[PDB]
């Protein structure tokens, strides 16, 4: 696999979404609206965290993800509909992919 393991940490200040990975991963992160979105597009690696959103998570009204093929290869959309306004950070470190979804306080 590359993607394997992905696990949601909800907290008040800011909910971490991490996804783990046999190889680093390339991604792009965007933000839709109508609903307010964020967006992740993972290549090499389609990474899909569902179930894990909680019902509580002040941040993530929800998580959606899907992988399309091009050629041999795949890429994955993980969508994260939205509670509020965001500032996403985003950070790779080893296998790890960190996005934590900060509100509208980027600097304490």
Do not use: M
């Not at 949601?8 to 965007?30: E, L, M, N």
């Not at 992919?97 to 900060?102: A, L, Q, R, T």
């Amino acid at each position: 696999n590359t993607l394997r393991g992905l696990d949601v940490s909800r907290t008040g200040s800011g909910a971490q979404v991490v996804v783990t990975g046999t190889r680093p991963p390339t991604f792009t992160v965007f933000r839709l609206s109508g609903p307010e979105r964020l967006v992740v597009d993972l290549s090499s690696a389609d990474a899909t965290g569902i179930k894990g959103h909680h019902e509580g998570s002040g941040p993530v009204s929800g998580v959606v993800a899907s992988q399309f093929s091009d050629q041999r290869a795949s890429v994955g959309r993980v969508l994260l509909a939205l509670d509020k306004a965001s500032q996403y950070d985003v950070r790779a470190d080893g296998n790890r992919v960190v996005i934590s979804v900060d509100g509208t306080s980027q600097s304490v």
